[PDB]
A paper describes a structure:
At the first stage of this study, we replaced circularly permuted EGFP (cpEGFP)—the fluorescent core of [name]—with circularly permuted BrUSLEE. Since the permutation procedure in the original [name] involves the deletion of a 4-amino-acid fragment (corresponding to positions 145–148 in the parental protein), and, thus, the removal of the 145th amino acid residue, which is an important structural determinant of the fluorescent properties of BrUSLEE, we engineered two variants of the construct, with ([name]-[name]) and without ([name]-[name]-145) the M145 residue. Four calcium ions are tightly bound in CaM domains at the corresponding binding sites, confirming the holo-form of the indicator.
Author numbering: 45 to 157, 170 to 233, 237 to 461
The structure:
Amino acid sequence: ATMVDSSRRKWNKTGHAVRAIGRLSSLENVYIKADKQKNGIKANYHIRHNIEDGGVQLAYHYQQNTPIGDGPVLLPDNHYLSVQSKLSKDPNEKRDHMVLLEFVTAAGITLGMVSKGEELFTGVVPILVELDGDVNGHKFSVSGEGEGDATYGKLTLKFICTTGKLPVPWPTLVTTLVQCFSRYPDHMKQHDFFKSAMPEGYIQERTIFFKDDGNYKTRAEVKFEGDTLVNRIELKGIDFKEDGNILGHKLEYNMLPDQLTEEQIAEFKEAFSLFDKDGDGTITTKELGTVMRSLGQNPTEAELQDMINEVDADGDGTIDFPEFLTMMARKMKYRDTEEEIREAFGVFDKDGNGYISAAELRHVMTNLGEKLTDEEVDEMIREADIDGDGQVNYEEFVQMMT
Ligand SMILES: [Ca+2]
Ligand SMILES: [Ca+2]
Ligand SMILES: [Ca+2]
Ligand SMILES: [Ca+2]
C-alpha cells in the first residue's frame, strides 16, 4: 500500500529529534550577567539572519549597560531573556519602514531556590526611538514611535528611515532599535536591572560582529523624558563588504506566519513523543538522557539540567509539551549553520565516511524507538537520493532536513 506516506512520517520524527537535540545543545537566548565594576550588567548572544537565497548570517553581540544615575540598582544573578520578534510592513506606508512586535520574558533560574523603578512600567508606556547611523561612510537616520507593556513583555514599534533608502537590512537593526519592557516572573523581579535603573535610565553599548563581514558599534541612552521612554542611539559600522550580505541587501525580511498549522503541531507532536517515553506531556532529564545515549552521546546530569534550562520557560526543570512547541517553532524559523548541519549528519554517519549508509540509518532509528523494516528504510534513502548512489551525502542530507 503506502510505505511512502509512513516513511515520510518516520523520517520527520527522527529529523526533528536530531534537530531538537542540536537546539538543546545551543545557546540561543540573551545571556545576562552582573558587572560589579560598572555597577551594571553585561550580555552576550547571537542573532540568525536568514540569507535570501538560502543560508544563515550570524551576528555575535556583546552588550554592556551602565546606569546614568548615582542611585541604587539591582545586580542580577546570571539568567536570560527569551525573545520572539515579528517584523511586518504597514500597507499604507510609502516610506522605507519597519513594524516590530516583540515578546520578551526572563527565565534561566529554576524554581528550586521588587524595585522602585518597576512602578513606572505597570501600564502601557509610550516609546520614542531615534538613531543616527554611519556604515562604511553611508549615513542614515531612523525615527520610531510605539508602546511597551511590561506586564506581558510586549513591545510594538514603527520605524521610518528619515534619510530615504536604508543602506543596511532592517533585520540588522532590530536589536539596536528597550529591554526594560521584558516580563520578569514574580520569582525573578530582583534580577531586573533595566527597570531598577529608571527614571534616570542606562547607557547601552554593543559591538555586533557579522561573521564573514563587518561590525556595528552602538551607544544608546535609554531614559524617561516625561512619561515617554526614550532610546537615542548612535551606530557606527566599519569593514563591510560592498557585495556582502549587509551592504548588498541579501537578507530575508520576515517569512513564516508567526502561528503553526494543525499539521506542523502534529509533526512536532510525533517528535515530542520520541522523548516523552511515558506519555505524561513532559520531558525529564532521565528521558533526555535515554534519547541522547541512544544517539551515541553520553551526557552528565548537569549537562541534561543545562539543556532543559535553555528552554524551560516555567523553571520546573522539565520540558513540557508547549515549551517543546515554542522551541521547535523557533528552530523552524531560523536557519542552521554549516557546522550545525555537519553535527546532525554525524549522528547518522557513525564511521565518519561522509556517507549515510542504509545500514547506519537503520541503527539510528532502532535505538530511538521505531520498528522500521528493510523495505521502509530503503524507501527513505530513495526519497532524497539525488545522485542514485544508494547512500545519503551531506548535500542530499541538507535537503532532507527542510
Ligand atoms: Ca515524560
Ligand atoms: Ca518546564
Ligand atoms: Ca557512513
Ligand atoms: Ca546519494
